């Protein structure tokens, strides 16, 4: 199959200038679980 790691993808999202580390943080936090 195929692997991946979210910590590096999140830092890339934070660098990309989409939203602030607040919104991306809420995103990763909903990503974690419910």
């Amino acid at each position: 199959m195929r692997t991946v790691s979210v910590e590096a993808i999140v830092e890339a999202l934070v660098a990309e200038g989409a939203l602030r580390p607040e919104e991306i943080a809420d995103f990763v936090e909903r990503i974690t679980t419910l």
């Binding site: 199959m1 692997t3 830092e11 660098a15 936090e29 974690t32 679980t33």
Partner: protein
């Protein structure tokens, strides 16, 4: 000083007038995983001794050390992905000195851009003494650079 450019006397930098302190904040979690728990530790596997000179015995960069983009701030080691393979490996765990699995490097490093000198650290460890750590979050560690 074309359109709206400005020209500056080097006397300002000597007198250090236009200097302003700035502090960034770097953060990692020692999350807990299918593979096994991740660990905030100093013995990272494939690291030269020179790359560890500034990390304390726990893996955290020491206070007062200049960190350049690519250095280690907090050392984290996580087990090799793709799972715990029960049929065969579970026997090996009893055969071969148990906990002699494999662990990789997933530390925290000064990003492209830069950092400065480490000025403060924050450990929020298990046995959580008043902290709301997220589900599967084991500890969190912060380093402030200036």
């Amino acid at each position: 000083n074309f359109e709206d450019a400005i020209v500056i006397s080097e006397e300002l930098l000597k007198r250090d007038f236009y200097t302003s302190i700035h502090i960034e904040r770097y953060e990692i979690e020692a999350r807990d995983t299918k593979l096994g728990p991740e660990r905030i530790t100093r013995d990272i596997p494939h690291l030269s001794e020179a790359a560890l000179r500034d990390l304390d015995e726990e893996g955290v960069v020491r206070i007062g050390a200049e960190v350049k983009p690519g250095d280690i701030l907090v050392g984290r080691t996580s087990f090799k992905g793709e799972s715990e393979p029960t049929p065969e490996e579970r026997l090996l765990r009893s055969i071969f000195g148990e906990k002699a699995r494999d662990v990789k490097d997933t530390s925290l490093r000064v990003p492209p851009g830069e950092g400065g000198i480490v000025v403060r650290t924050v450990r929020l460890r298990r046995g959580d003494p008043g902290v709301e750590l997220k589900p599967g979050v084991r500890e969190v560690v912060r380093v402030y650079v200036a």
